[PDB]
Amino acid sequence: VGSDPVILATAGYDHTVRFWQAHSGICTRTVQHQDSQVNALEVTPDRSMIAAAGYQHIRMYDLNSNNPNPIISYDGVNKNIASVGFHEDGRWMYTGGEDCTARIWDLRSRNLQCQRIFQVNAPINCVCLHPNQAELIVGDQSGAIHIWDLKTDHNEQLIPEPEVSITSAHIDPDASYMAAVNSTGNCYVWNLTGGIGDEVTQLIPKTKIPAHTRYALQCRFSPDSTLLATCSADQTCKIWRTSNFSLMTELSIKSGNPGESSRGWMWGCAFSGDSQYIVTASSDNLARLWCVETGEIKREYGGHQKAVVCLAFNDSV
Amino acid sequence: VTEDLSKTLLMYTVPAVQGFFRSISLSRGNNLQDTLRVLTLWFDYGHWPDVNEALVEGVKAIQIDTWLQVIPQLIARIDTPRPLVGRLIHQLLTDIGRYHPQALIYPLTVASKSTTTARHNAANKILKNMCEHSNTLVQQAMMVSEELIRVAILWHEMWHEGLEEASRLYFGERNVKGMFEVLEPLHAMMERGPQTLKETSFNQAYGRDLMEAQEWCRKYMKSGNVKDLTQAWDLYYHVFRRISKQLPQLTSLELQYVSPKLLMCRDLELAVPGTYDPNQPIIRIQSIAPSLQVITSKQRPRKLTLMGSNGHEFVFLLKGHEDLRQDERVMQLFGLVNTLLANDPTSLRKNLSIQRYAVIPLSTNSGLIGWVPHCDTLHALIRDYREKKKILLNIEHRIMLRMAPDYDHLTLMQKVEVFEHAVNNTAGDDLAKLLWLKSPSSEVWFDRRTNYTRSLAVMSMVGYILGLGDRHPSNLMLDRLSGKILHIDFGDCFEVAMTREKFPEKIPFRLTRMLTNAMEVTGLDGNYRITCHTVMEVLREHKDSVMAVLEAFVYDPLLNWPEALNKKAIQIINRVRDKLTGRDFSHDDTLDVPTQVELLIKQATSHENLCQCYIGWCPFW
Amino acid sequence: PMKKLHVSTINLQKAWGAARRVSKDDWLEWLRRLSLELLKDSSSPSLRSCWALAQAYNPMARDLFNAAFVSCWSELNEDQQDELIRSIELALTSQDIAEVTQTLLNLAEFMEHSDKGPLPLRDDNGIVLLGERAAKCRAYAKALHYKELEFQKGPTPAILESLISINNKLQQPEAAAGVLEYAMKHFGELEIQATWYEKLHEWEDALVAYDKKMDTNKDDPELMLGRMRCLEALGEWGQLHQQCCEKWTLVNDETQAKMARMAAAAAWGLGQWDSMEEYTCMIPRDTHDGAFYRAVLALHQDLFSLAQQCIDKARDLLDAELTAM
Amino acid sequence: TGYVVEPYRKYPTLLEVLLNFLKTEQNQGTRREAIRVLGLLGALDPYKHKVNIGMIDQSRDASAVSLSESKSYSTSEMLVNMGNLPLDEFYPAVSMVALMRIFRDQSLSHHHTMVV
Ligand SMILES: Nc1ncnc2c1ncn2[C@@H]1O[C@H](COP(=O)(O)OP(=O)(O)NP(=O)(O)O)[C@@H](O)[C@H]1O
Ligand SMILES: [Mg+2]
Ligand SMILES: [Mg+2]
């Protein structure tokens, strides 16, 4: 599956993980993920290994071989694991769980247990890391975004809205803007600080974006730091412009008939390096690839028997 | 400073006691509030002399029967360290027994079997004082209490429970000493020997195996080798399998097999449990039925029956594994709330009284529950409705399983996906249509639905203050005549279910969509919300009486099932104070009743809170 | 058992012969004959055995009217059922008698409970028809039930009007408040009319709204009636009597009949008994209100005999309403 | 005597009997006298009427010591209690209910022939 420079992976409740190519439109292979569902997917930066985070275990999947089983099934976390994240070299993999623990484990070794642990009062929603790989934004269920220092373990915590569940967070590669998204349908964007190791890493909030009137789930910056995509529970994803946070782009799957409502949420998004094609997952069994400029159905990845949740996307020249 | 404080307290307390006693004498029936206030003043300042003489004079002057309202609280402080307070408590209890032994024997019987030394010997002393003039009634109550405790849990029952617990301990906790501690009472009752036909049959069937296991245990702690332990486990497993296969066959117990003494006694002078009332003739235990129906639930209660001296059957549900003292005190608090709602004319007109039953604990593990007639559990009601309509009982649950067969294994928002899919694709109007169908006429339907909504609001707010959890549909019941809601199990009061590790409850009360649809079609913004506001105002204004009733939990080990115990109890009461005053949600802020009720309705209706509920709670319902 | 019996269809729809039934005696006789013929043509032998006793004892026929209709109805085919529905609709629509309407609404709710299902009385199972019939029949719990069925089928501001009205005429100001909150949440765009406050028992606000709407439209009937109702409820007898004197000279006689009740009440409150004599003339003599107010006038003039038979007539007229309610 | 309102409380069935007269009898004079008695006794508060007949009881509801209950029809009520079983068994049930309603009543002895 690692032959093509362009690769994406998909997973959900069907106890399987599927892989797709940009211009194929047909699943390459389906690999079983029995015994549990799946919450997150991520392809390592080196494009040699995929982490699938589900319930009480994180599974590792090869990218160059031909239809193997899971190769390393890490276990130990007593409850649901919610997020994944890798270093640029891929040795250290970050993660957050529903058991009030945000952890960092090893990948290039045979260690069978965690390497670093961090406590937080509430379960950890999706976690993300600063591009320089020296700071962690951890999103808890209590709404308190945690700034965690990798070189001093300093745990700053900012709650921009009391008693709400922040659902996801993402920081652009340029380390200029960072976005967080919660169940209130709001996108909170803060300016970064141009620090390296000065321990400052100050975050300066900006104007609030009423992204949705419904539970907003996944917010992600583009690799070019030009556009942001926020997909929510109202079957709507909005692609805001980083320049002014305006919007002329709607991503909806509403049938339009009141008798066909509750079709399914959009559960995630993934930009491309060029950032003109965006792939998102939709709990109506299906993943959709659109183009931001026109917002039309470029491809639909049929094959999932049950609903889809999480996606990963890696591309190369 | 301290001396002036004491002087001010005494000069503002002694007039308080005098006035309260005068008001109680002038009330004659509507005096639960005043009696509780007197008890609070007596407990907090009775040891002070002048307060002591004032209380003595008031007690001597005041009618005795009034104190029947507050028998538990008195016994909850029977072991007060202060000399004068304890002396007056004992004298008052002795008087209450002298004139009204029927009301006070059962709580005293419960207190006698207390592990605490002070409570134990005080209860023994008061029972001796009772005996001094009513030896017959005292021993009769003791005998019937012991026999009903015996019938509550058969030797089968406690042996099965102990074997189950040992299996968890040895394999789960690897606690062999814990196993020995758990088993020691079982060996103790073996040494006690059989005393009924069922006990003798169980002896002849399994006692030899049990003694052989005891012998390998003797070998174990005489040598210290797990080989003897495993030899014991062999017969433990065999007897456990035998008893487990036998248990479902005990669908109905005949008394002569399990308790011939109940059959021997007839035309008793003891009052039927939970029916004594000094203003009416005493209904007495004429006989006991020759067969007890048994429910197939996990705890296995017994549908016991009495034939009263008035010829009317009195049905009870006899529990053996639950602490019924909590249920009794919750019934007392419900009685206080009923008094409060009747006192206010606005709430009095609306019939906001909480339906309640009689709870008679017999020990720290067993008791009797009044079997309320013409009532159906919400689970049973919905089951009957869906069987009748050919709708499938678990339709929402299997819709969730179809969307996610591992529904329990998802993250929060994925669980919200599944839960909202199940809710939005199912009508959820079972209770509305069922209230309509179970009503003779639209007049009766409207009356029943008004009562249902108002009682649901009353119990929602009271349970929230009470922290009453585990409100699953089987724990709610509906009247076939009045329509009021009845809450029957109170084993998870004070947010106990909201802190347990496994499937913690994230809602204050049950307000699922099925209930809200049975309300006015316009929703819960009307009758329900307004009744909640009314009840919260009534409770917040009279929070002193609620705290007075709840002090019984402060000075008892009831919530344990020891300064840690006191710390936990005061923490729970602080939480209840926060709920009543309004500082529950944010300690730094106080909320008016509309705001608090809106927040609580949002919490009880939120899908994030509802989806996390354990599946058998039927949050989708 | 004895099996079923053939429901003679001809005589069955013949028993529903409301074509030439006009007077109250006619309609009571129609109800009696229908309740007897249902038993006579009942399919179940158990009911038909009671027909002979019902004939000589009508209350038996009244007791089994619902069951007798169920037995007769379950045998008819689609076309015969449709004819029966048409005749039932005609019976409900024809004349508003408390006894006959009460019996028919009781039958409707009985069929609603029965496994046969609600009577397909119209496209809406007679929900609208039965609701309005219950409303004007003084039986407001049935009216509430059918109005809530209307609401479930779809909420409209008119359904909210009627639902507030019914709930407050059931003495449920809290339910009416709930309906108001539903309106404000889901219909905040529309401007809440004066009739809402009138039915919410918000008499002061209702009067304010009626005044604010009347200044733009002089001499409007419905506005006048609502303003008078608000004034009577508020106890403003002086203003009510001033309004009555001002507008009595131009009101239509049909609407003057509606004027008369509140006019007489206000005049009594003040004490212009000649004005009461003038107003009570318009109140019909066949209504309890008319007889009672005529008795009041007679007593003020000290015609004790006249007031006595007026009170007797008032009781006789109130007998039907009291029996129905 | 002015013994008003109290008769409802001391005779809870009085109001029910007076109202039931309006349903049963047809003579206009008797009905007018029934209405006269109803008015003379007073228009009882519906809540007070419920209290008199016991549908609402604050003596037991507000009592601190709860008390156990002392036990373990119209055509519509008959259907409600009979809706579980078919109509074929409902017809004889309601027929017998009405027949017994007449038959226990001795004042209708002249119908007891046909009833049997
Ligand atoms: N007070 C009561 N009045 C009438 N029926 C009752 C009463 N208490 C219990 N029941 C009925 O008996 C059933 C079993 O009793 P219950 O109290 O549910 O025992 P359990 O299931 O062992 N308790 P828990 O595990 O705490 O839910 C109930 O579901 C009701 O049907
Ligand atoms: Mg149970
Ligand atoms: Mg229970």
Residue numbers in the entry:
A (entry chain B): 8 to 324
B (entry chain A): 1869 to 2429, 2490 to 2549
C (entry chain A): 1254 to 1578
D (entry chain A): 851 to 922, 929 to 972
What does the paper say about this structure?
The mechanistic target of rapamycin complex 1 (mTORC1) integrates growth factor (GF) and nutrient signals to stimulate anabolic processes connected to cell growth and inhibit catabolic processes such as autophagy. Direct binding of RHEB–GTP to the mTOR kinase subunit of mTORC1 allosterically activates the kinase by inducing a large-scale conformational change. Despite the fact that the receptor–PI3K–AKT signalling pathway originates at the plasma membrane, RHEB signalling to mTORC1 occurs exclusively on the cytosolic face of lysosomes. mTORC1 is recruited to lysosomes by the RAS-related GTP-binding (RAG) GTPases RAGA–RAGD under amino acid-replete conditions. Here we reconstituted mTORC1 activation on membranes by RHEB, RAGs and Ragulator.
Using symmetry expansion and particle subtraction to remove RAPTOR–RAG–Ragulator, we performed 3D classification on the subpopulation that does not contain extra RAG–Ragulator copies and identified two distinct conformations of the mTOR–RHEB–MLST8 subcomplex. The final resolutions of the intermediate and fully active states were 3.61 Å and 3.16 Å, respectively. The M-HEAT domain of the active state moved closer to the N-HEAT domain than it did with the intermediate state, with an average distance of about 5 Å. The FAT and kinase domains of the fully active state moved about 5–7 Å towards RHEB compared with those in the intermediate state. The mTOR–RHEB interaction is largely maintained in both intermediate and fully active states; however, the residues Met1255 and Lys1256 of the FAT domain of mTOR are disordered in the intermediate state but engaged with RHEB in the active state. In the mTOR intermediate state, Tyr35 in the switch I region of RHEB flips to the opposite side and is disengaged from the nucleotide, whereas, in the mTOR fully active state, the switch I region of RHEB adopts the canonical conformation of the RHEB–GTP-bound state. The FAT domain of mTOR is more engaged with the C-lobe in the fully active state than in the intermediate state. The established electrostatic interactions between residues Glu1581 and Gln1355 in the FAT domain and between residues Arg1585 of the FAT domain and Glu2311 of the C-lobe in the fully active state indicate direct communication between the FAT domain and the kinase domain to promote the active state. In the fully active state, the ATP molecule was positioned 1.5 Å closer to the catalytic residues in the C-lobe than in the soluble mTORC1–RHEB structure, aligning more closely with other atypical serine–threonine kinases in the phosphatidylinositol-3-kinase-related kinase (PIKK) family in their active states. Finally, the mTOR–membrane-interacting site is only seen to dock in the fully active state (4), suggesting that this interaction is involved in finally reaching the highest level of activation.
